[PDB]
Amino acid sequence: YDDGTINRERSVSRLAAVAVNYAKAGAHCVAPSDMIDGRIRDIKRGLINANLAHKTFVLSYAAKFSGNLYGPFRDAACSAPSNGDRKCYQLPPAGRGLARRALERDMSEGADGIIVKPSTFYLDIMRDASEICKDLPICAYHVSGEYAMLHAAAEKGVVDLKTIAFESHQGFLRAGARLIITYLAPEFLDWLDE
Amino acid sequence: MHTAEFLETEPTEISSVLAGGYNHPLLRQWQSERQLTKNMLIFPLFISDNPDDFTEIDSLPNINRIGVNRLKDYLKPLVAKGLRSVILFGVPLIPGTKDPVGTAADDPAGPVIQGIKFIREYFPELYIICDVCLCEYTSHGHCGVLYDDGTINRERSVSRLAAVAVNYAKAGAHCVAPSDMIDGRIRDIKRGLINANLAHKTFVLSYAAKFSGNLYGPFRDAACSAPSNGDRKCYQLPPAGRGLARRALERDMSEGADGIIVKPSTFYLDIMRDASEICKDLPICAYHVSGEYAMLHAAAEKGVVDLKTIAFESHQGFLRAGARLIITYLAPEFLDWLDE
Amino acid sequence: MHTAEFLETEPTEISSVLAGGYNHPLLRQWQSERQLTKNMLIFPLFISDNPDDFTEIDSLPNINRIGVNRLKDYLKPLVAKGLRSVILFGVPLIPGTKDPVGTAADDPAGPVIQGIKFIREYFPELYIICDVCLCEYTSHGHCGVLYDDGTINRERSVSRLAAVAVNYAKAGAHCVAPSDMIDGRIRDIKRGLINANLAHKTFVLSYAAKFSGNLYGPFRDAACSAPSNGDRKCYQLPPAGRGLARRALERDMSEGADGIIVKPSTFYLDIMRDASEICKDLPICAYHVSGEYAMLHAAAEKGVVDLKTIAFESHQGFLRAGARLIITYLAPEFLDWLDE
Amino acid sequence: MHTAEFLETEPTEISSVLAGGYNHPLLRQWQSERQLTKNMLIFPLFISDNPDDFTEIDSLPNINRIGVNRLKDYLKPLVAKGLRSVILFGVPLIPGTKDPVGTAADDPAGPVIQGIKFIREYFPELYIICDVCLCEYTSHGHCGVLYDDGTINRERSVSRLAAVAVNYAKAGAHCVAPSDMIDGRIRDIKRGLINANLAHKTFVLSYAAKFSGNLYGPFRDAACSAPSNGDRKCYQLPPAGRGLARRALERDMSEGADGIIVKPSTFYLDIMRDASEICKDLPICAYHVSGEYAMLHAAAEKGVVDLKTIAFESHQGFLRAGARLIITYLAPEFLDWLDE
Ligand SMILES: *[C@H](CCCCCC(=O)O)CCC(=O)O
Ligand SMILES: *[C@H](CCCCCC(=O)O)CCC(=O)O
Ligand SMILES: *[C@H](CCCCCC(=O)O)CCC(=O)O
Ligand SMILES: *[C@H](CCCCCC(=O)O)CCC(=O)O
Ligand SMILES: [Zn+2]
Ligand SMILES: [Zn+2]
Ligand SMILES: [Zn+2]
């Protein structure tokens, strides 16, 4: 909006277009990560009208929280909320009630799956999701801050990288996830073999 | 030209609109099921049998091993800042003090009981929790009395444990927190307290869901006791074992726990949630373990995160998952922050 | 002309649209609550008291009766392909070896215990499960000690059974799987293991929901023992009895089962689901029975189905219904397939 | 000597004792939540456009393709034995009769509608169910109208389907059973029936949970139509997909299904159970598929099982899992057996 807060209507309108265009280009799955109210509905409707809903997985970041764990990401995809705070749309860390409502909402609006982000620090929300979205695949996102915290701790000798990597990621599966987005995927491609 | 495309959309459904509930700073407080207060905080104390002790524990940043004559000067600022509870771990370093049956566990001249008498005299408003285990007192560093083969002897171990716990309560501990994970020990501790006419005044805070893992590093570097010859996995639950943790939670509640501890904490938030449903009528306590505590200190130092920010995030995480109590090495920092 | 008519319809409701979730090969993997892995597989072994045995079991395609000196050569390829667990059935063929009280059940020179010692020595990474029953050892071919009239004697039977199970664990079995279905036997087996100081290391895997039926054909043709004079229906549950199976499941869990077996499997998938709710905190195991296994081999041979396709369909069926373990005669084929 | 050992045991706990409930033949009837009756049975009919047809369907033992002038002589013994319901599948073999949009589906001179008029006139006590799909009528053998690329066109397909279903009801079908699995088709069929003033008298029996698999073999060998160029997996649910089946069940109920079909049956008993909870207020119907039916015939012939025994076991299995209806090719045998 002219004031700087977010314009729901024009934003979701813009977002649905992008998602559809990614699917037109050949993406199998779109994962909206904006957290703007009602965007999954408009993305699903957009895919329907484009005759792509029958082949596009909508993987919503349904429970995405504000926090101190996104550090390295901004240092990669170069984009950190200049002038403002992404807390008026990311949920507050203490807000379990809102996350539960956001989970039911995205499922009801057409999500085929949901992402919980960050992961370790939100395992209880993953569990909540496993009950509310029991018929849907749940995906854990091990965020750059969580990933950097493990690398740092190991380097300092607090823990062993591979041990704490398997512990944290088995932690996702214990809490209800059956999918994991992780920067340690290349190491896991190796380890799971042996 | 590639121009910005905008799809036609439907009017907003009311059911979509959540942001009305967290647009303002005070609303993100409204949205919390429990808010962090000072009396929620339990600070662990490692008591040495050298009474003039004050030794830095290598891998436990800003945490030390302290003897009785250094205790009042260390605990006075904290109690005057709002500290309400301590959890005691004894670290007897005198040679000859460890033995097969963990005899020194309840030695009246031992660090724990002396620590109990100290605090009871000089800080009688302080709530005293005592860890109950043999690992700190055994020659082999395990949490119970072994069989000749080296596995654990359930019967003799719980028999030994109940004695210790009762003795800690006799000495004046308000709360006993058994951390051994040996099957059925809460029953025998409760029965022991009953027969000693102390059950009506002793809180039994069970480490009901305690997991094996890579997060206990600095602790062993403090209370000097890491499972020589063997692995504490045959009694600590496997990290993937949600089913066993749920069963262990129902068991300890049914055996008399007044409260339960989930340990470690951040990495087991889903188990805390499980506990909040199964043990809904009981206080649930999070233990932020030395490995978790050291991981945060390390990450901050490296610039990955801000210590105080991630400390508040992690600990509010405990409250979100169902805990209303927190055992944490960051209690002294939180005594400061909660004021401002 | 008859032309193709098309009714006017409403815009698509989002609530109608599911295909977004399974349009791609990797999504049909995403959609599974559990994926089939190699360590899920338990392969049954029939051990003969003739140590040089290797006899084809007529009605059990590609499955044989093997003695101790033929075991290492038979199990070596499998363990090196990923086999992690075996379930042992003894087949004593020596005359004079069967008797009223099933004495040979725990004979230290008997096929089971000798099989246990063999595997423990030459394959110490293998997890050993022992079937626990008397039917293979009794003169009359029934699963417990009878009354003079021929019905089963609960007390003496469970007394006899607990002894056998404990003896198998003494000999080194990691897991005992009682398959008799006699009321209360899990309690007495657990108590027996407790008193022998073996409960802390022995998995009790109860055949909690075992049904009467037409699917056990080849088994009797292997372990030579089909209910002479009588019917095993007065202890196996009736196929229509869902209520009894549910009660039997709660009972065995409450009596100490660490896991439960549902048998047969395909034809009882709804009971597996029932078990997944009642015994939600316990591992559930599917037993693909010799009749089910022979039915698939027969159907394929006749061209009704493809063996490997229907094998993966049936066994993924177990995982869908709640099982995370499978006892199956197709384990050797699955050791191969899961690789590719 | 190795003697039979017997452990000391505790008195019997009442909670252990279940056998009091199934010791007698009439009790295994008491124990059933539903008993199999004759009016539960629905027999499929394959109607050819050659009215003098009576051709054996290779892979469907004792089942044939029949034209209108052979129908009364074939259905008379059955109706007089207790048959109450039929499910019609048309098999138009005349050249030029298949086409892109499945025009022949609701051809008034087509086998289905002619079959409807036949039965309505000569067997007006018979309840008529019509399969609703395009696969039997399309040039490419798929269950809906395709996009140029070959995937399925949801809108035009459901539009085409609703027309067919309504037309079957106009012709006098009592029940329509859509088997295409295309998202949202039940809504449009119900709306179509409403607008035609037929919803008050037409049962909509949805194939809500229909899975991909290896069990449909003989069917394609009967109704001649197997997915040329492609795979019916992008609309049939994956076998491992319990979550999708549960969602599909809630969807079809919410869209107006009066009943639901689970197909295949034995191999999906856990889904039947799921359905019994989600669609608890609706009749649930089991479809024993041609592959399942052929597998039983094959297994019996090979001696693995007894046909009638395993037929009663499997079909009582449907009732145990929650079904109160069964579509089965063994209906004629069951008309006989249920009498004795
Ligand atoms: C980006 C969506 C996924 C979270 C990035 C995860 C990571 O690697 O840190 C938006 C997140 C944000 O920067 O607010
Ligand atoms: C000690 C009981 C509490 C866990 C220690 C927490 C910490 O600060 O690391 C026994 C744990 C063990 O070492 O196994
Ligand atoms: C044997 C216990 C497991 C069932 C055998 C499974 C098979 O391969 O057929 C007792 C079953 C019995 O014969 O009653
Ligand atoms: C036909 C609908 C009912 C399933 C046929 C049952 C049988 O007798 O095999 C469509 C199924 C298909 O061929 O995909
Ligand atoms: Zn300990
Ligand atoms: Zn038996
Ligand atoms: Zn079709």
Curated annotation (Swiss-Prot), chain A:
GO terms for molecular function: porphobilinogen synthase activity; zinc ion binding. Inhibited by divalent lead ions. The keyword Lyase applies. 5-aminolevulinate 2 binds at residues 144, 183. The lineage of its organism: Eukaryota, Fungi, Dikarya, Ascomycota, Saccharomycotina. It is an enzyme of class 4 (lyase). Keywords: Heme biosynthesis, Lyase, Metal-binding, Phosphoprotein, Porphyrin biosynthesis, Zinc. This is Delta-aminolevulinic acid dehydratase. The gene is HEM2. Present with 11600 molecules/cell in log phase SD medium. One of its GO terms (biological process) is protoporphyrinogen IX biosynthetic process.
UniProtKB/Swiss-Prot annotation, chains B, C, D:
This is Delta-aminolevulinic acid dehydratase. Belongs to the ALAD family. The active site is at residues 210, 263. Keywords: Heme biosynthesis, Lyase, Metal-binding, Phosphoprotein, Porphyrin biosynthesis, Zinc. It catalyses: 2 5-aminolevulinate = porphobilinogen + 2 H2O + H(+). GO terms for molecular function: porphobilinogen synthase activity; zinc ion binding. One of its GO terms (cellular component) is cytoplasm. Pathway: Porphyrin-containing compound metabolism; protoporphyrin-IX biosynthesis; coproporphyrinogen-III from 5-aminolevulinate: step 1/4. Its EC number is 4.2.1.24. It comes from Saccharomyces cerevisiae (strain ATCC 204508 / S288c). It is an enzyme of class 4 (lyase). Zn(2+) binds at residues 133, 135, 143. Catalyzes an early step in the biosynthesis of tetrapyrroles. Binds two molecules of 5-aminolevulinate per subunit, each at a distinct site, and catalyzes their condensation to form porphobilinogen. Homooctamer. SUPFAM superfamilies: Aldolase. It comes from the Eukaryota. 5-aminolevulinate 2 binds at residues 290, 329. Transmembrane segments: none annotated. 5-aminolevulinate 1 binds at residues 220, 232. The modification Phosphoserine is found at residue 254.
